[PDB]
Design a protein around this ligand. Structure first.
Ligand SMILES: [Zn+2]
Lengths: 206, 261, 60
RNA sequence: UAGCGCCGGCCAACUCCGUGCCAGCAGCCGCGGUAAUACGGAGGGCGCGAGCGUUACCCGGAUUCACUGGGCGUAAAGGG
RNA sequence: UGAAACUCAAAGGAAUUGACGGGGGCCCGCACAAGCGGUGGAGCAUGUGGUUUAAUUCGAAGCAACGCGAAGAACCUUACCAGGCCUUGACAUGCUAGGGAACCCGGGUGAAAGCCUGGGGUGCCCCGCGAGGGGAGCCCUAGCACAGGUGCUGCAUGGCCGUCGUCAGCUCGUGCCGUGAGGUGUUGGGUUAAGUCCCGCAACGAGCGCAACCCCCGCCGUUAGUUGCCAGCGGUUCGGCCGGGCACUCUAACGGGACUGCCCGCGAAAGCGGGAGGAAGGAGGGGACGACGUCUGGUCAGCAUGGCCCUUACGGCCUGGGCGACACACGUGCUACAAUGCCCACUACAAAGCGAUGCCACCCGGCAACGGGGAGCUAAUCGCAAAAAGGUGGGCCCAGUUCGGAUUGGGGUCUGCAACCCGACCCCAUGAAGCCGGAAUCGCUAGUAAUCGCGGAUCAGCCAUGCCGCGGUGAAUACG
């Protein structure tokens, strides 16, 4: 076993960096640290919204945060109160006048992080794991998605012994570079430990 | 099995991207999914703690859904409407009611004089003609009077027994009630009017006169009064009562209360 | 990586040669990198995530 | 005057406490060590009802002595 | 010839899928064989087992633990030990009583932590009449929800990793065969690095795997010519140094090229043996890439995490010690045992990297480690930087030796608050074991083995002879 991260494998080709900025050796670490802080804050805050991705950019002491969300309605709210206070909070974190942007993902069934998050939520709601995985895979496959696969880690239904569940459908060629495989991991914290939900979505070629 | 029946129910309820709807007893949310897909902001009154996770998971990808942990009977729905549907034009009600609390629910909803556009519900055929009938229909009664007074109602859909996953015991009929702007007949003494209606149908075999005289505490006292009133109003008590209507009942009620109330 | 030890290495330890470096993500003191400020494990994790700009798998 | 048996599959009738290979149940298959629809008790249900169960014996199911209506190369059964 | 009493709920027949066999057949891989160097012998470095100790913190245990976690233990690291000390606490969000708000500062104590203290107070926000003034702004000081735990289980788990193994396998859909479990495909012949292809055949396809898609090297085009380059010309202090060009090398972007594509023979085909052409010829060399699964595999000490436990101590500061012990025993390495060599002068030829709390040109002082002055460089410019083996010339002449450099004595430099336990380096003496290593055993099929240097991470400095990379010279053998 011991497969490698399908994103880190395809960073150069068919995938793009989540962070897009340049810095010399002098200031690389500080920028990365504040970047991590921003990512952590936004992960904590915008959970319910259906976050999928956080993008960070820098031009000249400027930050352009972009957040991919299934339901931007949750993010904005009434008269953009929430987004405004969120911008205020982010700017208070780092004195660089961040320019927050919000994008809606088309067909949130085609986002591996979202699928993993949903299945993790279902697990935390004490759903049957096998049925949940089957339904998730079918749901993804109905929305185009030339291939899908979902894995749940272990410690199923409070059983003493842990076991992997696994379910795939279609083509998931993890070995080919021009595969455009979307990957998503979610951790489900349950009364009887932790479960790891992985999702691969094979969405076209090249 | 419920695959297309729900779509037909929603179609008959005639919801659009601007109409608001009220859901009672959502369970999983079979109707709720279709309602969210077709209609504007929805609302639910689930009370079952066990099915709450399943409903939450079902309605996770929807943003126009509100869930309330209140019983319909106990909760004053006026505030519910004034709070939730603050922009909507027409507020309808769609639900599948659980047998027992089906008549109480309808009665409570109607007796509170909501600004609801109407109601579309799925209940059993048994009590379906009992709330949409005519003179001499063998299903005429107090329930029919109440429903056909408060609103305008007619049975729409007949879902047969052989549709559900676990085979039930009774055929079902989806009924649509278009709410009425003003009550069909004007009664000053509405309460005793209702008691009169229930008195004329305490026993459906006896004649109307005997029904009326034998069902009032003052029935013994005002035997002559009852007889004269029924005689003058051109609708005598010699009939059964199932052959009367809203109009005759209104006239008789006026006769009783203008003179003895 | 006791919380005390992490919170202690963040001050001036009365001398220059008493101070050391820790992973900014996990507080590991063993195998950190000056360029990143991350231990080897956090470096690998974040590099796989694609959250390190211009950092890619090498094959020469 | 309403009782009697049963509610794991045969076979119509399901939950909560008590017990923890103990006390026990059992026509067969079997159930009892911590979440027991299989033991004990309650609620409820099912069948029969001045009755309902148990034991004993006979025929059936048993084409399992095969006249109706079985078989004998390797399952028992071709004689040296 | 031939019972019964008593016991069990089975006893059996054929066939299917596996597991296994001191059954068989075929095939593969530095597995063996043919070679070339080693290890096991000596000294030292390092990691362990034991032993010792107040402590010698722990985890890793055939392959797949043992120059492993650790890409840097003198303090810090540090989790261990001996002492001195704190208990809403190093650290977070709160609650409730007034001192009362912030900050600056000075003595006792002293090994430091901590404690006791004495001073300028750093106050406004409202500016109610403005003189107390109730306020948010900070701050202590008690009462309390809470911190905290490298404390235990990897046999409750996640994530990540090792291993069989880059081995060639693991399955599914429809069809067909069978009463049925199931079979077929996926077996047979050939071929391949390969379930890679061809043929045969009730199978025809597909998915995860193999391959290819990606990167580096090998050849050539364009686009581009500075900090890189210099063929022709003009300068020239002889320096690509100047003016020039950018042709060539090169640097870094985009493409081309190699596919049994083309001829000859052979085979039914896959393919095989030769031949041009070509930089490369049949996978061109290397990397990234690790199937369903196996190992109660490894890690609660990277992190997260369910359960259990401690919460005036199993938490937290500080000084010193320890992880560096030593009758012994294993593993991985470094230097050698010499003349194909050792020492000393001169002269050459690289690549890939690194640097502003740094790289440090040059000059001067010292025999030196270094010190003082001092330019130039955020980098194709400046520097680290001497490349070493090599090639020349001189010496040694078979000797435990101009071999080997352990150990010890005596000076000295640098880092650092501090160099005793316990750093590195320079110099003068000292000059050990070692004359090629028993049984056994390891690596390697080509720019490989062997040998020679160079750079980097961690890092004040370094116990690095380690790890990751980079080039120089360059063997032998493979019948089976
Ligand atoms: Zn880390």
């Amino acid at each position: 076993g011991n497969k490698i991260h399908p994103i880190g494998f395809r960073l150069g080709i068919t995938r793009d960096w989540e962070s897009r900025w340049y810095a010399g050796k002098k200031q690389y670490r500080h920028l990365l640290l504040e970047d991590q802080r921003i990512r952590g804050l936004l992960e904590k805050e915008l959970y319910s919204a259906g976050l999928a991705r956080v993008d960070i950019e820098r031009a000249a002491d400027n930050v352009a945060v972009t957040v991919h969300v299934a339901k931007p309605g949750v993010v904005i709210g009434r008269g953009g109160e929430r987004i405004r206070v969120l911008r205020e909070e982010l700017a208070k974190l780092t004195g660089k006048n961040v320019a927050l942007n919000v994008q809606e993902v088309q067909n949130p069934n085609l986002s591996a992080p979202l699928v993993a998050q949903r299945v993790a939520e279902q697990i935390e709601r004490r759903f049957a794991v096998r049925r949940a995985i089957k339904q998730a895979v079918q749901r993804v496959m109905e929305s185009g998605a030339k291939g899908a696969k979902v894995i749940v880690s272990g410690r199923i239904g409070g059983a003493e012994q842990a076991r992997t569940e696994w379910a795939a459908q279609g083509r998931v060629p993890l070995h080919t570079l021009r595969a455009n495989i979307d990957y998503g991991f979610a951790l489900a914290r349950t009364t009887y430990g932790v479960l790891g939900v992985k999702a691969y979505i094979f969405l076209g070629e090249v | 099995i419920d695959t297309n029946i729900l779509n037909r129910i929603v179609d008959h309820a005639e919801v659009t991207e601007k109409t608001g709807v009220i859901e009672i007893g959502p369970g999983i949310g079979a109707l709720t999914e279709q309602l969210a897909k077709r209609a504007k902001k929805v609302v639910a009154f689930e009370i079952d703690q066990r099915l709450l996770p399943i409903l939450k998971d079902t309605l996770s990808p929807y943003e126009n859904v509100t869930v309330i942990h209140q019983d319909v009977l106990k909760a004053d729905v006026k505030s519910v409407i004034e709070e939730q549907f603050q922009d909507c034009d027409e507020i309808m009600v769609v639900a599948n009611l659980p047998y027992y609390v089906t008549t109480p629910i309808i009665m409570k909803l109607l007796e509170e004089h909501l600004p609801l556009k109407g109601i579309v519900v799925m209940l059993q055929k048994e009590v379906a003609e009992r709330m949409a009938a005519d003179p001499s229909s063998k299903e005429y009664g107090s329930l029919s009077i109440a429903v056909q007074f408060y609103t305008e109602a007619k049975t729409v859909m007949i879902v047969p027994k052989t549709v559900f996953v676990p085979q039930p015991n009774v055929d079902s009929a989806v009924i649509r009630l278009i709410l009425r702007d003003g009550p069909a007949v004007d009664v000053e003494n509405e309460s005793f009017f209702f008691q009169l209606i229930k008195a004329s149908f305490a026993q459906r075999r006896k004649t109307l006169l005997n029904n009326l005289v034998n069902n009032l505490p003052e029935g013994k006292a005002q035997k002559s009064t009852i007889e004269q009133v029924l005689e003058e109003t051109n609708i005598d008590g010699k009939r059964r009562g199932e052959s009367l209507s809203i109009e005759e009942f209104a006239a008789l009620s006026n006769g009783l209360y203008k003179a003895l109330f | 990586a006791r919380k005390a030890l992490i919170e202690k290495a963040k001050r001036t330890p009365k001398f220059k040669v008493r101070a050391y470096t820790r992973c900014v993500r996990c507080g590991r003191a063993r195998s950190v990198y000056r360029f990143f400020g991350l231990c080897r494990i956090c470096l690998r994790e974040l590099a796989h995530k694609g959250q390190l700009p211009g950092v890619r798998k090498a094959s020469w």
